[PDB]
Write a protein that binds this ligand. Structure first.
Ligand code: EON
Ligand code: ZN
Length: 257
């Protein structure tokens, strides 16, 4: 059993998951002076079908918005990829205070939250479960969220949280295109990395947007208002779910810009 508290947190994870001290761990600090511009990086092409939106679920440490992933209605293309990747999910990470909460940092700068839009390699693999542990199995768009103005595009997501307040609760969440949450510029960093929580597989090609999106201090409070406990128990708010940045270990972060 793992979490983000004292006993079961990021510093304890290695005890059950030795890959935590691996060579391709995420998130990282992106140092802009150390990034290598790569001229082969194509533009990011996302093409998502609103009808693939399926369900929202309170997973105890976080919440997920899952998508139907049986066909190629919702796909990521371009960037560092030859393979088309299929959308299956988006979720957020946040912190105890506005001062932190993002997973990735840029030149030491911590943002207030981070949006992850995750995809799996359906050109190569037959399922998420197969893809999940493969070097080229996963592609995740990471978007830094900067505290400021309320983000109207977050609304439907925020409004759905009242129906999944406690652990294990789930509800339909339909007719939503998560490319509406993405920044208007898709300029990006890319590097080979991992899932940022157990099982911490080194299967993720990260796409980190240069441009941030907004979130208000109140919108952040709604995330932290979600409960980690099951219905009927003592209310335990999901205060934070961000992993500390990890050693780059010789990896190079490429820039598309
Ligand atoms: C393949 O995923 C998984 C496979 C098996 C068990 C848990 C997860 N993972 C999860 O519950 N969240 C999750 C986390 C990220 S992340 N934060 O690294 O971008 C990306 C996609 C994910 O679905
Ligand atoms: Zn994530």
């Amino acid at each position: 059993d793992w979490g983000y508290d004292d006993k079961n947190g990021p510093e304890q994870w290695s005890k059950l998951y030795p890959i935590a001290n691996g060579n391709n761990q995420s998130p990282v600090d992106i140092k802009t002076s150390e990034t290598k511009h790569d001229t082969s990086l194509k533009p990011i092409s996302v093409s998502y079908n609103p009808a693939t939106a399926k369900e929202i679920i309170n997973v105890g440490h976080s919440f997920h918005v899952n998508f139907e992933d049986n066909d190629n209605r919702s796909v990521l293309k371009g960037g560092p990829f030859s393979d088309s990747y299929r959308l299956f999910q988006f979720h957020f990470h946040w912190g105890s205070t506005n001062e932190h909460g993002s997973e990735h940092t840029v030149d030491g700068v911590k943002y207030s939250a981070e949006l992850h839009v995750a995809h799996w390699n359906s050109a190569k693999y037959s399922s998420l479960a197969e893809a999940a542990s493969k070097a080229d199995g996963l592609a995740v768009i990471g978007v830094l969220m900067k505290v400021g103005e309320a983000n109207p595009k977050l609304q439907k997501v925020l409004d759905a949280l009242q129906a999944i307040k406690t652990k294990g609760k789930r509800a339909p969440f339909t007719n939503f295109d998560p490319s509406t949450l993405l920044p208007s510029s898709l300029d990006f960093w890319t590097y080979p990395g991992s899932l940022t929580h157990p099982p911490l597989y080194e299967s993720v090609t990260w796409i980190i947007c240069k441009e941030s999106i907004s979130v208000s201090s109140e919108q952040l409070a709604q995330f932290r208002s979600l409960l980690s406990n099951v219905e009927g128990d003592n209310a335990v708010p999901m205060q934070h779910n961000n992993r500390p940045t990890q050693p780059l270990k010789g990896r190079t972060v490429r820039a598309s810009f």
